[PDB]
């Protein structure tokens, strides 16, 4: 994706947005007791630890844009991937303003904590005013739908979160390019069954993990990926998606039977409202559109299928098994294919594909080394057929040392226990013991290890 043009909001007569220009992240009491580097992201041009122009930094992610019509290999991959997806028998029927608004079984009511987006953000009017959860009202939406229409621009906040020392100074703090409520209900109303299917079918058929409890799903990935092993992750996946991949994503939904795949063009080329200065981009996935997670996965399934055909000759795609959660990949084939080969090959579609999280360089992948959703795979001692998701203790330490509002310093610490304990009894007791060094640490009521193991076992 490349930025084709920049204008001022004045030119379009649009009220600018005062982007939250201060981090709400402060150091928690566990800042001294645990180790970590990561500090909060840069949200302002002045921010003293910044060694670079922020304007340029925030948008450097848009490296360029490769222009082709879909390759022959590309085209095979969409017919094969779409093929698998037909077997699921996904309804092509569209959803209702009421369904799309407040969920069905499969979907979850649009979050009334996220931004409504343009133009609502600049009218002070937020999600609650339109959305009555108890009533399940459709008058306020239908009104503001008829009024402002669809295909509205995107409000581009800059995301407030922990970043590594490098991504702090180099101004890499990434963006959420948030969608208008109009647009998110619109295509949530006609690809609602596409999302429904992916949420109910996390696996090797959808090539998807989006919406899955790793607690249980971890202990089933190894049954599904029965073959050799590869894993990947990209740097700036979203921004790097040249339009071609979108023309494939559409082509897939078209074969699936969704009139509405036209929407996909509407996310490829988009307008973004950053501070005032409104950008317009060709390509790139909006990080925080409606089906971002799902569309990425689908495209990733298109991409590795393509790269592997590009790279190799005599290959049956039916035995190629894939599992993507956005940029995160796991893939398996009966024969040992070379990750490195693939990564290079994809670099001529504009992609920077890379070894999975916590991996220095492409070696043969093994269940001992693998990462997915930032977690290791550690099979249980007593019952080796059950598999633990092990979020590394560094990542958990790095999270506990900061806090937004130290009232929910419990809710946050408890949540970290549900992840920590998978590391094993020895480490979990060291963890809560160190937490309980601090004075507010001891007042927190924490689950004991045997409690957490039992809750986990009961899930089966
Ligand atoms: Sm990733």
UniProtKB/Swiss-Prot annotation:
It is found in: Host cytoplasmic vesicle membrane. Transmembrane segments: none annotated. Replication or transcription is subject to high level of random mutations by the nucleotide analog ribavirin. Mg(2+) 2 binds at residues 233, 327. Mg(2+) 1 binds at residues 233, 327. It is a peripheral membrane protein. It catalyses: RNA(n) + a ribonucleoside 5'-triphosphate = RNA(n+1) + diphosphate. Replicates the viral genomic RNA on the surface of intracellular membranes. May form linear arrays of subunits that propagate along a strong head-to-tail interaction called interface-I. Covalently attaches UMP to a tyrosine of VPg, which is used to prime RNA synthesis. The positive stranded RNA genome is first replicated at virus induced membranous vesicles, creating a dsRNA genomic replication form. This dsRNA is then used as template to synthesize positive stranded RNA genomes. ss(+)RNA genomes are either translated, replicated or encapsidated. Binds 2 magnesium ions that constitute a dinuclear catalytic metal center. The magnesium ions are not prebound but only present for catalysis. Requires the presence of 3CDpro or 3CPro. Interacts with Viral protein genome-linked and with protein 3CD. Residues 227-341 form the RdRp catalytic domain. This is RNA-directed RNA polymerase. Its cofactor is Mg(2+). It comes from Human rhinovirus 14. Residues 1-460 are cytoplasmic.
């Amino acid at each position: 994706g490349q930025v084709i043009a920049r204008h001022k909001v004045r030119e379009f007569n649009i009220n600018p947005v005062n982007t939250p220009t201060k981090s709400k992240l402060h150091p928690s009491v566990f800042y001294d007791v645990f180790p970590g580097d990561k500090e909060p992201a840069v949200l302002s041009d002045n921010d003293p630890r910044l060694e670079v122009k922020l304007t340029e930094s925030l948008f450097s992610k848009y490296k360029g844009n490769v222009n082709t019509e879909p390759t022959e290999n590309m085209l095979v991959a969409v017919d094969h991937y779409a093929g698998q997806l037909l077997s699921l028998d996904i309804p092509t029927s569209e959803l209702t303003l009421k369904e799309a608004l407040y969920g069905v079984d499969g979907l979850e009511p649009i979050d009334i904590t996220t931004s409504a987006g343009f133009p609502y953000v600049s009218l002070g009017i937020k999600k609650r005013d339109i959305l009555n959860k108890e009533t399940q009202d459709t008058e306020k939406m239908k009104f503001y739908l008829d009024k402002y229409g669809i295909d509205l621009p995107l409000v581009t906040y800059i995301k407030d979160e922990l970043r590594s020392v490098d991504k702090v100074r180099l101004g890499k703090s990434r963006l959420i390019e948030a969608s208008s409520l109009n647009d998110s209900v619109n295509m949530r109303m006609k690809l609602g069954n596409l999302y429904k299917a992916f949420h109910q079918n996390p696996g090797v058929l959808t090539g998807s993990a989006v919406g899955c409890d790793p607690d249980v799903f971890w202990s089933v990935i190894p049954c599904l990926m029965d073959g050799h092993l590869m894993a990947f992750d990209y740097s700036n996946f979203d921004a790097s998606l040249s339009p071609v991949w979108f023309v494939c994503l559409e082509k897939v939904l078209t074969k699936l039977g969704f009139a509405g795949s036209s929407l996909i063009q509407s996310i490829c080329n988009t307008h973004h409202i950053f501070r005032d200065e409104i950008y317009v981009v060709e390509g790139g996935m909006p990080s925080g559109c409606s089906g971002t997670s799902i569309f990425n996965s689908m495209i990733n399934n298109i991409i590795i299928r393509t790269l592997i055909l590009d790279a190799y000759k005599g290959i049956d795609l039916d035995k190629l098994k894939i599992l993507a959660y956005g940029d995160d990949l796991i893939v398996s084939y009966p024969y040992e294919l070379d990750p490195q080969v693939l990564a290079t090959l994809g670099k001529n579609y504009g992609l920077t594909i890379t070894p999975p999280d916590k991996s220095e360089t492409f070696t043969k992948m093994t269940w001992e080394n693998l990462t997915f959703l930032k977690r290791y795979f550690k099979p249980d001692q007593q019952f080796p057929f059950l598999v633990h998701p092990v979020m590394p203790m560094k990542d958990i330490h790095e999270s506990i040392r900061w806090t937004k509002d130290p009232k929910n310093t419990q809710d946050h610490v408890r949540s970290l226990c549900m992840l920590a304990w998978h590391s094993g009894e020895k480490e979990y007791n060291e963890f809560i013991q160190k937490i309980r060094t601090t004075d507010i640490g001891k007042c927190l009521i924490l689950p004991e290890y045997s409690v957490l193991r039992r809750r986990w076992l009961d899930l089966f």
